[PDB]
Amino acid sequence: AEQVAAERAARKAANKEKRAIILERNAAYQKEYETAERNIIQAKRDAKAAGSYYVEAQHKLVFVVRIKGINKIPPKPRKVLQLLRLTRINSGTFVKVTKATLELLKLIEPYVAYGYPSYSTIRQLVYKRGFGKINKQRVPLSDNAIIEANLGKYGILSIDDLIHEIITVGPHFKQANNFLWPFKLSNPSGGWGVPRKFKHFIQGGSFGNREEFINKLVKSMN
Amino acid sequence: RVKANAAKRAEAKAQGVAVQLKRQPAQPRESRIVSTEGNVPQTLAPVPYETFI
Amino acid sequence: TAQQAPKWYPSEDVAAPKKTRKAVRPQKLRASLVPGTVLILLAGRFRGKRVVYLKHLEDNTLLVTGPFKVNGVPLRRVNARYVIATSTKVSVEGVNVEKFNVEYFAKEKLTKKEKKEAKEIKTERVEDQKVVDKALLAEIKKTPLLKQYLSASFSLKNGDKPHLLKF
Amino acid sequence: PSRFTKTRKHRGHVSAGKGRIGKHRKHPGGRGMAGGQHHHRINMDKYHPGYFGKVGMRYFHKQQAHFWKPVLNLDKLWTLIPEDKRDQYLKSASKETAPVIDTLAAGYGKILGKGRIPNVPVIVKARFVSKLAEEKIRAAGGVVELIA
Amino acid sequence: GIDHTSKQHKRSGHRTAPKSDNVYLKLLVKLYTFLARRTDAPFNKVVLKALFLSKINRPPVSVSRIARALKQEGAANKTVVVVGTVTDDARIFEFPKTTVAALRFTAGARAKIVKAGGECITLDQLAVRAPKGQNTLILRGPRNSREAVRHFGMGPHKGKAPRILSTGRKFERARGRRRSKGFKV
Amino acid sequence: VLKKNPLKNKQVLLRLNPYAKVFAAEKLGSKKAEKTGTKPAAVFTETLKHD
RNA sequence: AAUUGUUGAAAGGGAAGGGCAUUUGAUCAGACAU
RNA sequence: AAUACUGCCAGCUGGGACUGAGGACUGCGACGUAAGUCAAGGAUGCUGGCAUAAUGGUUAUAUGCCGCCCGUCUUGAAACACGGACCAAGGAGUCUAACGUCUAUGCGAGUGUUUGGGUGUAAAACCCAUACGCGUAAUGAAAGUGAACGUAGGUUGGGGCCUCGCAAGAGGUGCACAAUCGACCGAUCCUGAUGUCUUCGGAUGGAUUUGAGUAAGAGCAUAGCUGUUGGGACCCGAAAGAU
RNA sequence: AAUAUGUAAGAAGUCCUUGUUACUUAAUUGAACGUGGACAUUUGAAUGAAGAGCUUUUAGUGGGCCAUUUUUGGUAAGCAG
RNA sequence: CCCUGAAAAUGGAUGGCGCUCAAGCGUGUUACCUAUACUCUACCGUCAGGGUUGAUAUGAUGCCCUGACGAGUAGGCAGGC
């Protein structure tokens, strides 16, 4: 196979075109995020100016991290944790928010800390602790080629494609989140901010729906 | 429901559109604006304890 | 036979190491090590003595001098981490430093077979020292107590807080 | 052998693979077949359902020689003809020269009718023949001639 | 710790390489391992996996079974593949010419096949004749008909062939088998 | 062989995300939003400051 | 081997023994010498 | 207007600690028109001292912290529960008859030489006739009867193969196996043909009946682990009974 | 009431036509099983599936104890159930 | 909150010392300490998925790549001394 130059040129051209497509898609996604957040802010401002209240839409996804160990767990919460793939003590998973998943979270309330992650939290999670599920093996999300090989069926071509399908619950969110391996997060740097974790966050504890406060905890635990 | 999905699927195929035949769990409610025209909020506070016995 | 020969002898050649990627960029020196700064030696033969920083040598070392007429520290090189950079700067433009490089302090190595080292200075080195120190002494003299200061040797006194002591 | 036995693997283990609570005692459930109508009843009714009791009349001084009657089916009926003559007789299907098969001399008593046979005549000599075996042989074109 | 949802370190449970010191069988296993590695033909995988089966798992396929398989429409000229032993059947009389490939052939079965006009082939010759198993028909002997199987799963109202040593009127057909004596199974 | 973090390694960051270069060039992380001045309604302000 | 004598070393405020880690004393291999 | 608070930056930058796994290139990518360079699929560069008990190992000791006596019965043992003063040697799931599952092997509708004969370099090895044992036929108490309507059947799912197709898939063939509906053999209950030692024969056709059956054989023999039974039966142990 | 609990959420299905029958209906009426034809990527809610299904054989065990909650006998018990 | 109610036998126990705008009680916010837990890395082993015919320093039971996992009496099996 003395002909290597043609193969190199073809591969380089294909990679250049793929990188250009990924760049244009990421630019479109950045424009979309800016447009959505600025539209939400301006809608709030306009309602307040007109004399009303703008009730934001309920968040579409949650991030759920186990907080409890593995010993002495009742069967129903244990099974729900297994179904949410929070096997280890500090594993984490994104979950679409519907009635069924809300009931799931209510069943596993005393063993998880969950909220709605921001784009910053989601992006940092995918970049640092993003791992795939190729051939039942947990491969790291090192290059966009790995993501294109498996999720090219659904149009998820890049890691930012994956982040987009995660942040905006989309047509293939189930497939994207299933492809993402359960994140193994470290303990929160600087502690949990609480003397005792095993009370609901409302009760001055750590578990339960922390909602918007989940970002700080997840960033510390990353 | 089986024949209902049959009817919707036939109609969607005739009109060349997606079927979306699956049910969906209760989705989170979308964003909406609540007016105050004749609905000024009423301030509510706890009630002090008074025995009825 | 006392021990049966193994079926498989491992390969005998030495495999070359892979192409490492550790290209050397020149060392960045902290801003306090401006040439012409009065430093203090914290380790070595001349520990505690104050010297003048002249040139950053080709390798990561600092060429320093007493100047030798005061406190008897000759032209040496030291390491940045082993000196403390005071704020008593002295002008250095009056001396020539291009001659002194890494090869200038070349040690004539003696093999380990000698073992008879139980019992002199280069004349070139003594003349360079006498010219550099005589060129630096005039710069030193322009300020009141710098010569006596360089003759003195640094030493922590009781109650000193190196975390709060300015330099 | 004795080196592959699990006893060698059990050296160093206190109970030697026989448990700590219910140690290997002499005979906890009685000797062999003890308590068939008793504590072993569940096993003896689950795996040997028709054991206890008696069925049928007796036969004093029964001799198996009288009952000697090995059975032979038609598919195997062509085996008693020697191998080399087999194709010669199969090819030459003739009522004039159909082969004689002495099943008794071979060692069989009864000829039964399982399977088919090629459509060639054959004189079969048999102590006993089933109805269907005789029907099949006669349909093929031979004759079942009884002997003794 | 891990909330283990599956039994850890459990073996796949399937035989890999035969549990036999037959050097020639090992050679065939090596050959078809290479073929299954570097060929996308599922025939290679299935024959490699069948090379491992035990004796009770490799029932002897009869030449009568061979003929019945060849009787199938569109499979008259196919090469029959048998990972096992082919046995002579003195019940059939007309046998069709074919190329039968198997590990071991009984003397009678080999004689029958060569007399019919076809030729007997060993699995290495099969590999050199059809690397991807083209025009091949895999046969298999009957598994459920061995003597030991009839006793399996015995219980009441199952009728699974009691393990009685000596069969007779007295043995294992008294009370518990007929309604007059006790009950019925 | 090794897992290099995109966040703390600019090289692998640019590998994973081609948009990172133009993002840094345009300083989109500290974008200056346009200043639009609208005032909340007196009803809202009174309801906020109400007992 | 249990057990005992002498010599030598060491420790020892109502047990001795042990694990992790090092100071101290005694003792010791390998490698540059290629 | 600022600031506090919260949040973001694919903003910059300083100090510290641990790690250096891999070993020709391959891949992704960045800077450069380019050559090439690079922090880009895991450490390199420069320098110093020692080159021997210096590092390290072993051992004794000190110090800091931890450390209950082992085996056994037990829900629970350090137990104020039992055995153990110490040491050397001996010391406890073996063998056999019959076997169950699984596995290896030889032959395979056959299989098993070794009861015996022949032979022998002599308890070895080699050869062999006739039978018998098991299997190729089951069922019934027994008399007895005794397994193809058919391409050894129909339906469903089937690995694999074949045909078409770039593939997705479609069609054909579909062994093994699984479910089911039938056919046949036997038994039980029925129906009772030709006929006739006129009381014998049981043709044909049925049954929410059942049998350890047939439905193009799968067994025999040897060896092995495990398990079962009788044997002293894993080792040691009675009060007793008899001659 | 709460907690627990059964079933279903399709391909072994649905729709159209017409076949078999000794069952059934006054009647091809109906019942069961069928021939042929039609369906899509959402093939009939969510989540997860670490492979799914199946077989043989066999060990030890068959003295239990405690904690939250419900609860019986008892005044109660480191009581008994 | 404190005091009386408040009596048991060897000397004695917020663990001890001891503590009084506490080192007590109630509450709030930070900082900090450390498990064989969590995160990353190395190594050992196991399991699983794979690559490798090229003559072969041979041996395909060999070499190599990827991922996850590792507690345990009775007991089972395997590899070994």
Other Cβ atoms within 10 Å of E113 Cβ, number:
25
Nearest to A111 by CA among A217, A24, A219, A200: A200
Secondary structure, 3-state, chain A: CCCCHHHHHHHHHHHHHHHHHHHHHHHHHHHHHHHHHHHHHHHHHHHHHHCCEEECCCCCEEEEEECCCCCCCCHHHHHHHHHCCCCCCCEEEEEECCHHHHHHHHHCHHHEEEECCCHHHHHHHHHHHCECCECCECCECCCHHHHHHHHHHHCCCCHHHHHHHHHCCCCCHHHHHHHCCCEECCCCCCCCCCCCCCCEHHHCCCEEECHHHHHHHHHHHC
Which amino acid residue lies closest to nucleotide H216, measuring CA to C1'?
E64
Q: In what order do the strands lie in the sheet with C37-41?
A: C76-78, C62-65, C50-56, C37-41, C83-89
Within 8 A by CB and 6+ apart from A120, the residues are A215, A219
Cα separation, E97 vs E77, in Å, equals 9
Exposure string for A115-141, b = 16+ CB within 10 A, e = fewer? bbbbbebbbbbbbbbbbbeeeeeeeeb
Q: Is the CB of B13 under 7 A from strand I?
A: yes
Q: Which residues of F touch B36 (CB under 8 A)?
A: 43-44, 47
The integer distance in angstroms from the CA atom of E9 to the C1' atom of H196 is 83
Question: Rounded to a whole number, what is the distance in Å from the CA of E64 to chain D's nearest CA?
Answer: 12
**D136, D134, D96, D101: which is closest to D118 by C-alpha?**
D136
Distance from A112 to chain F by nearest Cα, in Å? 27
Beta bridge partners of D146: D126
- Residue C40 pairs with which residues in a beta bridge? C50, C84
Query: C67 preceded by cis ω (within 30°)?
Result: yes
Question: A26 and F19 in contact by Cβ < 8 A?
Answer: yes
| Nearest nt by C1' to A185 Cα | J39
Distance in angstroms (rounded) separating the CA atoms of residues A89 and A180: 18
User: Is residue E63 within 8 Å of residue E88, measured between CB atoms?
Assistant: yes
Contact indicator for C45, C82 with CB cutoff of 8 Å? no
Measured CA to CA, the distance from residue E85 to residue E92 in angstroms comes to 18
Report strand pairing: C50-56 vs C37-41: antiparallel
- Asked if A120 and A91 touch (Cβ cutoff 8 Å), the reply is no
Between residue 32 and residue 61 of chain A, the positions with Cβ below 7 Å from nucleic chain I are none
Rounded Cα–Cα distance for residues A182 and A92 (Å): 6
Question: With a 7 Å cutoff on the CB, does E12 touch strand I?
Answer: yes
Q: String of b and e for E4-43 (b: at least 16 CB within 10 Å)?
A: eeeeeeeeeeeeeeeeeeeeebeebbebbbebbeebebeb
CA distance A8 to chain E (A): 26
The token duo for D103 is 């099943």
Structure tokens at E42: 């599922």
Q: Which site among A21, A31, A32, A45 would you substitute to test the F interface, given the most F Cβ atoms closer than 10 Å to its Cβ?
A: A45
Cβ burial of A4 (10 Å; 0-12, 13-18, 19+) is exposed
D110-112/D128-129 β-pairing: parallel
> In angstroms, rounded to a whole number, what is the distance separating the alpha carbons of residues D122 and F4?
89
Would you say E70 and E45 are in contact if contact means Cβ atoms under 8 Å apart? Answer: no
Question: Under 8 Å CB-to-CB from A147, ≥6 apart: which residues?
Answer: A132, A141, A156, A157, A158, A159, A161, A162
- DSSP helix/strand/coil, B32: strand
Q: Which residues of A95-104 are buried (b: 16+ CB within 10 A; e: fewer)?
A: bbbbeebbeb
Judge if the beta carbon of A79 is closer than 7 A to nucleic acid strand I: no
Q: Indicate the SS3 state at residue B7.
A: helix
Pairing of strands C83-89, C37-41: antiparallel
Specify which residues E86 forms β-bridges with.
E61, E105
Nearest residue on chain B to A101, alpha-carbon basis: B25
Q: Tell me how many degrees the CA angle A122-A123-A125 measures, rounded to the nearest 5.
A: 65
- State the pairing for strand pair C62-65/C50-56: antiparallel
Please tell me what DSSP assigns to residue E177. S
Question: Quick one: tokens of E26?
Answer: 């090992």
Taking chain B, what is the end-to-end CA distance rounded to the nearest angstrom? 56
Q: Name the DSSP letter for residue E184.
A: B
d(CA A210, CA B40): 30
- A125: nearest Cα among A198, A56, A201, A215: A215
C77 beta partners:
C63
Taking a C-beta distance cutoff of 8 angstroms, is the pair C52, C147 a contact? no
Chain breaks in chain F following residues, C–N > 2.5 Å? none
Residues 14-33 of F with CB under 8 A from A: 15-19, 22-23, 28, 31, 33
Distance between A102 CA and the closest CA of chain B, angstroms: 10
DSSP element (H, E) containing E126: helix E123-129
Q: Considering only CA atoms, which of D22, D21, D24 is closest in space to residue D7?
A: D24
What's the reported resolution, in angstroms, to a tenth?
A: 3.1
Q: DSSP code of E47?
A: H
**Comparing C-alpha atoms, which of E87, E39, E100 is closest to residue E61?**
E87
In angstroms, the CA C88 to CA C39 distance is 8
The whole-angstrom separation of Cα A124 and Cα C159 is 48
CB E39 within 8 A of CB E47: no
Element (H, E) at E82: strand E79-87
Task: Tell me the backbone φ, ψ of residue C153, rounded to 5 degrees.
Answer: -120, 130
The whole-number Å distance from C161's CA to H17's C1' is 24
Check if the beta carbon of residue B31 is closer than 8 Å to that of residue A57. yes
Distance CA E151, CA F42 (A): 91
Exposure b/e, C42-53, CB count within 10 A at least 16 = b: eeeebeebbbbb
CA distances E161 to A202, B24, D42, E149, E156, Å, are 68, 54, 18, 9, 11
E40: left (phi over 0), alpha (psi -120 to 50) or beta: alpha
**What is the distance between the alpha carbons of residues E56 and E63, in angstroms, rounded to a whole number?**
19
Q: Specify the DSSP element, H or E, that contains E105.
A: strand E99-105
The two structure tokens encoding residue E135 = 């025009």
For chain E, the residue count is: 185
Can you tell me whether residue E137 is helix, strand or coil? strand
User: To which residue do tokens 């609480």 refer?
Assistant: A194
The two structure tokens encoding residue E12: 């796949």
Three-state DSSP string of chain C: CCCCCCCCCCCCCCCCCCCCCCCCCCCCCCCCCCCCEEEEECCCCCCCEEEEEEEECCCCCEEEECCCCCCCCCCEEECHHHEEEEEEECCCCCCCCCCCCHHHHCCCCCCCCCCCCCCCCCHHHHHHHHHHHHHHHHHHCCCCCHHHHHHCECCCCCCCCCCCCCC
Give the integer Cα–Cα distance in Å for A122 and A124.
6
**Residue F39, helix vs strand vs coil:** coil
C-alpha to C-alpha distance for E114 and E71, rounded to whole angstroms: 19
Q: How far apart are CA A215 and CA A92, in angstroms?
A: 13
Distance between CA atoms of D130 and D135, rounded to whole angstroms? 9
Using an 8 Å Cβ cutoff, are E177 and E185 in contact? yes
Q: CB burial class (10 A; 0-12, 13-18, 19+) of residue D23?
A: exposed
The Cα–Cα gap between D15 and D18 comes to 6
Does chain A reach chain F with at least 3 CB pairs under 8 Å?
Answer: yes
Query: Is B38 within 8 Å of chain F by CB?
Result: no
Spatial neighbors of C130 by CB under 8 A, at least 6 apart, are C68
CB neighbourhood size of F8 (10 A): 10
Q: Please give the structure tokens belonging to residue F1.
A: 């062989």
CB of A118 closer than 8 Å to CB of A150? no
Q: Distance between CA D83 and CA D80 in Å, rounded?
A: 9
Q: Is E57 helix (H, G, I), strand (E, B) or coil?
A: coil
Between the alpha carbon of residue E154 and those of residues D37, D51, E55, E143, E183, the distances in Å are 20, 15, 24, 18, 17
Q: Which token pair is D28?
A: 């906890």
CB contact set of C4 (below 8 Å; sequence gap of 6+)? none
Q: Per the structure block, which two tokens stand in for A176? A: 């994207």
- Report the residue of chain A nearest F5, measured CA to CA: A128
What three-state secondary structure class fits E38? Answer: coil
For tokens 């940045």, name the residue.
C80
- The CA distance from C82 to C76, in Å, is 13
Q: Is there a contact between B43 and F43 if contact means CB atoms under 8 Å apart?
A: no
Residue type, E35: L
Distance CA B9, CA B1 (A): 12
Say how far apart CA A82 and CA A91 lie, in whole Å: 11
Amino acid at site E151: H
Residues in CB range of E72: below 8 A, 6 or more apart = E137
Q: What is the DSSP string of chain D?
A: --SSSHHHHTTT-TTTTS-STT---S-TT-STTTTTTTTTHHHHHHTSTT-SS--S---TT--TTTT---EEEHHHHTTSS-HHHHHHHHHS--SSSPPEEEHHHHT--EEE--S---S---EEEESEE-HHHHHHHHHHT-EEEE--
